[PDB]
Every structure is written in C-alpha cells, then in structure tokens.
Amino acid sequence: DLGKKLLEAARAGQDDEVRLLLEHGADVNARDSIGSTPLHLAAYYGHLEIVRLLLEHGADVNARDSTGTTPLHYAARLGHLEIVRLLLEHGADVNARDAMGWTPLHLAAKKGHLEIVRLLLKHGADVNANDHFGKTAFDISIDNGNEDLAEILQ
Numbered sequence: 001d002l003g004k005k006l007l008e009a010a011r012a013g014q015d016d017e018v019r020l021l022l023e024h025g026a027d028v029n030a031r032d033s034i035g036s037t038p039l040h041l042a043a044y045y046g047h048l049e050i051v052r053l054l055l056e057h058g059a060d061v062n063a064r065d066s067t068g069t070t071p072l073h074y075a076a077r078l079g080h081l082e083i084v085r086l087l088l089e090h091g092a093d094v095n096a097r098d099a100m101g102w103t104p105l106h107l108a109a110k111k112g113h114l115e116i117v118r119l120l121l122k123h124g125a126d127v128n129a130n131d132h133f134g135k136t137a138f139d140i141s142i143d144n145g146n147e148d149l150a151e152i153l154q
Contacts, residue, residue, distance in 0.1 A: 003030020010038035010054070013047045022057045035065040043071035043087065046080045051087070061090045068098045076104035076120065079113045088123045095124070101131035109137035109153070112146050117153075127153060 006026035009017035018038070022028060029037050039059040042050040051071075055061065064070055072092040075083035084104075088094065095103050105125040108116040117137075121127070130136055135143070141150040 001030065002026035006030050006038050007032050007036070007041060010047065010050050011041040011045060013045060013050065015047075015049050015053065018050050018053050022053065028054060028057045028059045029063060034067070035063075037063045037065075037071075039063060039071045040065055040069070040074055043080065043083050044074040044078060046078065046083060048080070048082050048086065051083050055086070055090050061087060061092045062096065064096075068096075070096045070098075070104075072096060072104045073098055073102070073107055076113070076116055077107040077111060079108075079111060079116060081113070081115050081119065084116050084119055088119065094120060095126045095129060097129070097131075100133070101129075103129050103131075103137070105129070105137045106131055106135070106140060109140045109146070109149060110144070112144070112149060114149060114152065117149060121152075 002021055003026050006021045007030055009021055039054050062070055072087045097103055105120050128136055138153040141153055
C-alpha cells in the first residue's frame, strides 16, 4: 500500500520519500496495526520536517491510536520541543487524555521536560487535570522530587 510505505518512510525519517509518497496520494492518515498514523511515528522519532510535510497534506493532528495516544503525547513524552510547538500551532488538543488519563502535560512532567511543560502551559494545558491515578502534573512533580518543575507548577 502507499499508506504502508508512508508509515515506514515517516518512521525512518525519509523526508524525500514522504513527499513523493504524499504527492502520489498515499493515505496521509494510513493506520498501522495499533492505529498509529504517519504523524504519530514522525512525532515519536522527532522528524520535524516530516511532521510538517504531513500536516501540510492534511494529517489529522489529533489522531488517536488504539491506546488513545495522540501525536502530541508522543512529542511531549519524548521531549521533541519543536514538534510539540508545531503540533500545538496546528490545533493539537493540548488536554487530550490517553488510556491512563495522562495529558501531554502529565507526560512532560513525568519525563521532566521543562521547556515542553512551559510551552504546553502557554497553550492552555489544564494544570488541574487528574489522570486515572488521581494525579495532576503538580502531584507528579511532587512524586518525582523535581523541585524546578514543582516550582513552575505551584
């Protein structure tokens, strides 16, 4: 499938190959087995130009895989600040919750990504959102001893 090759070029960081596949008309939202889209894979691996190429062709910025994970979740977890920023400008749901009720803010708090945390807050991240464990991102910064972050959040 074109969407099959699109998914692999996105994961492999092959900018030229993504553009060609999209110009050919690969399904910009093709799904792998767990419902990942090429945008999840580009966000997961930090391929900003691909994220960019994908949005341009209409990728659903808010796609969810079978776990309810969005590309923003992946960018925030893995610490790709510039992917966070591009996704947010294209309308990514700042307060999307995955299967554990984790917002992208919870994930950036868990991993201690300070610049991502500020960026998300700038775009309206709900500081008061509890996950399914009944934790806010502040609770998590309290639970991890990240005083720098706890200081951002309180």
